[PDB]
Amino acid sequence: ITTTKPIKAHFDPVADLLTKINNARKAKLMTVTTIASKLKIAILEILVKEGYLANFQVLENKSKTKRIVTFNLKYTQRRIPSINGVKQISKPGLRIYRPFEKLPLVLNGLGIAIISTSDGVMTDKVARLKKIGGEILAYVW
């Protein structure tokens, strides 16, 4: 798949995506692109399994030196998004590490909390099921 425009991204990998999703939701835009990193790919995979975005495709160049993921949002028929609000926890500077007893529940389980404990990014419900916690990336509801 081809583009015409230069693709740039912020140095912080969680809030870069967070701005993209929130701005796309706010601007009613559907398709956006950014550079690919393994954390962003992993957070998007669990994100698409839970059903907040429709498709998420990561692509690579013909030289194998750069990869960019171009994702689209899952709008319903009336063109109101499925995402309502995004907020980041493990901000730069202040790294958020929480054990299981203080593992948050976002909107009584309606939203999902992204926690990368030991096996990559992982949802709050399965984190409670495994009774293991760790880094908390962002809140999405």
């Binding site: 059903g51 909107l107 009584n108």
Partner: protein, 155 residues
């Protein structure tokens, strides 16, 4: 049986060529205690006419309210100007722990157990505005089901 309770009676006035035109303004909240509530602010030379017009305006604008087990489902912040009101789910038994304008809105809506906090100003119009914005942005656990392609909220 749409009960109504005055939440504020201010005394506004303009200035003319000699004297002060004084008119009373009332903020009435009407609610059936089943999910319908509206607000109406009106001004008139006398309290009775002001009350009639305010109730008419309040009844013209009635919003729909959803209750879950008598309380609010998820924590929400209602914003209106510089007034920010925090609403919180409560266990069955605490009662309405609200006070003032927020307490009137919650009681007239039907909700029982409720944790509230006014984090901003003490202007009655903005407190009612903030409470209604917070309650109207609330998400049911079935609308997200149509969205998330889940199983009617099931884990």
């Amino acid at each position: 049986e749409f009960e109504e309770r005055i939440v504020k009676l201010k005394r506004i006035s303009k200035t003319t060529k000699g004297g002060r035109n004084m008119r009373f303004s009332v903020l009435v909240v009407v609610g059936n205690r089943k999910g319908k509530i509206g607000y109406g602010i009106a001004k008139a030379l006398e309290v009775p006419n002001a009350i009639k017009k305010a109730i008419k305006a309040a009844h013209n604008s009635l919003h729909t309210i959803e209750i879950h087990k008598g309380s609010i489902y998820h924590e929400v912040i209602g914003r209106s100007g510089a007034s920010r009101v925090l609403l919180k789910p409560a266990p069955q038994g605490t009662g309405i722990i609200a006070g003032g304008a927020i307490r009137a809105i919650i009681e007239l809506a039907g909700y029982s157990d409720i944790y509230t906090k006014n984090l901003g100003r003490n202007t009655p119009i903005n407190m009612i505005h903030a409470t209604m914005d917070g309650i109207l942005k609330q998400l049911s656990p079935r609308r997200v089901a149509i969205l998330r392609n889940k199983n009617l909220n099931e884990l």
